[PDB]
């Protein structure tokens, strides 16, 4: 099956209606790549991405990081420390607006 | 208690106004809106008022009234007390705008000495 990302689907199936691969969830908007830094809650992960910001006055850079909470389908089940790909969806909770679609490199 | 009575003839659309006081007016105190009472018992030369012959035992029913201060009576409020309520239509309020509601002062059902005007109609 394809959902517009041109990547491999997960090996097994699930019954979660919030799964973009096997359920009714739809993805549309930005797609990011990051590192998981927390997986304590059920079906929830925190993903961190790093980038550089340029300071015009001092003509130098500084390091900044962005943290995003994402839904974790059972068919994927990412853990702490591995690279993941996330996509934007409709609001799912107070703070969750993304879903994990692929694990790129297991820890 | 002095009552100013407005008697309406439904069969012609003509109304007459007379003033009633004394023991006769004391009889009328206590009645609500929507009850009949023979005119002969009250005591009135009805045929002289309208200049027309009338059938015997004709009676009238109380339709409305206004107190000495100018506030009207509302059929759906029990008792003789005076209240101030929020209204959207009906007697005692003329809307003038779609959906408008306003707070107005009104009287009740029962007749009391404060009432001055009493509107009644003949029932043949």
């Amino acid at each position: 099956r394809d959902i517009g990302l041109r990547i491999q689907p997960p090996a097994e199936k699930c019954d979660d209606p919030k799964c973009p691969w096997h359920g009714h969830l739809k993805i549309h908007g930005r797609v990011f790549e990051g590192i998981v830094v927390s997986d304590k809650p059920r079906k929830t992960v925190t993903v961190e991405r790093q980038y550089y910001h340029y300071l015009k006055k001092y003509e130098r850079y500084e390091l900044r990081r962005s943290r995003i909470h994402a839904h974790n389908p059972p068919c994927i089940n990412a853990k702490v420390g591995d690279r993941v790909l996330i996509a934007e969806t409709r609001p799912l909770s107070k703070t969750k607006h993304f879903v994990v679609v692929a694990v790129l490199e297991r820890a | 208690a002095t009552f100013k009575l407005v008697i309406s003839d439904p069969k012609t659309g003509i109304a007459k106004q007379i003033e009633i006081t004394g023991p006769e007016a004391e009889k009328l105190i206590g009645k609500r809106i929507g009850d009949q009472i023979p005119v002969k018992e009250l005591g009135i030369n009805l045929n002289e008022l309208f200049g027309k012959e009338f059938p015997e035992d004709v009676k009238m029913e109380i339709r409305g009234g206004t107190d000495k201060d100018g506030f009207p009576m509302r059929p759906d409020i029990h008792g003789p007390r005076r209240v101030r309520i929020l209204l959207s239509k009906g007697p005692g309020f003329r809307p003038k705008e779609k959906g408008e509601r306003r707070k107005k002062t009104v009287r009740g059902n029962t007749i009391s000495p404060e009432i001055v005007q009493v509107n009644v109609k003949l029932v043949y």
Binding site: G4, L5, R6, H28, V31 | -
Partner: protein, 242 residues
């Protein structure tokens, strides 16, 4: 707009595709909802008064319109707020003149004189296509109008094709496919008003719009969005273009 829709429009905030003096007065005509969108249309009053110059004041412009002196796509228009847009035909039969509305080289709307015979046809870009009750196909064009076709011809029409419609009868007489070698005219963007032939088409994942490459008469190649390319012929234009 604290509590409801806006009804006014300042001169300084007018759309940038009009030919208008932005500091002469305070207000401008807010266009009525209609065929095209805001960015590709202009109210009829400005055509009557400022472009052609048949009237000096707005009051005498309205008197002309109410007498039915102006035809847009072969239909009498009396509303001075009516929007007139790309590929429309403006006809004055009493003077016997006809114009087509086209974007400029810098993105402004201009009137291009055309012949009387060409004034009877209008090109429409197929913007969308759907199924409708009774199992029929409805075509939605770029100017908001609609058409119905039977289930038998469902394979003769696709999005981005162009249909040459005879107005005001609204009768189809030609279909121009979108493919390599077709002749196109650009309507928006940096390369607006350039024309040429299609060379290549590219696509992208996750809903990004697709891009086309066009070769002009001099042999130069340039890219633009697919939805900004308007098909006007097989290998030569079917209508007069500036």
């Amino acid at each position: 707009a604290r509590k409801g829709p806006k009804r006014h429009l300042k001169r300084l905030a007018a759309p940038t595709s009009w030919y208008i003096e932005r500091k002469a007065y305070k207000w401008a005509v807010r266009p009525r909802p209609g065929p095209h969108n805001m960015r590709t249309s202009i109210p009829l009053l400005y055509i009557v008064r400022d472009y052609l110059g048949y009237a000096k004041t707005a009051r005498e412009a309205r008197k002309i319109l109410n007498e039915g002196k102006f035809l847009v796509d072969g239909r009498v228009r009396k509303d001075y707020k009516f929007p007139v847009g790309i590929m429309d035909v403006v006809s004055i039969p009493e003077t016997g003149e006809h114009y087509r509305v086209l974007p400029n080289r810098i993105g402004k709307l201009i009137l291009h004189p055309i012949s009387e015979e060409e004034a009877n046809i209008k090109p429409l870009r197929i913007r969308n296509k759907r199924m409708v009750k009774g199992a029929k196909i409805q075509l939605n064009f770029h100017d908001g109008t609609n058409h119905l076709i039977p289930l038998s011809e469902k394979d003769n029409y696709f999005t981005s094709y162009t249909v040459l419609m005879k107005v005001p009868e609204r009768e189809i007489l030609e279909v121009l496919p979108f493919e390599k070698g077709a002749y196109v005219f650009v309507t928006q963007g940096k390369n607006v008003a350039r024309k040429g032939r299609i060379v290549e088409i590219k696509k992208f994942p996750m809903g990004w719009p697709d891009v086309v490459t066009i070769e002009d008469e001099e042999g130069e190649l340039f890219d633009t969005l697919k939805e900004y390319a308007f098909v006007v012929g097989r290998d030569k234009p079917r209508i007069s273009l500036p």
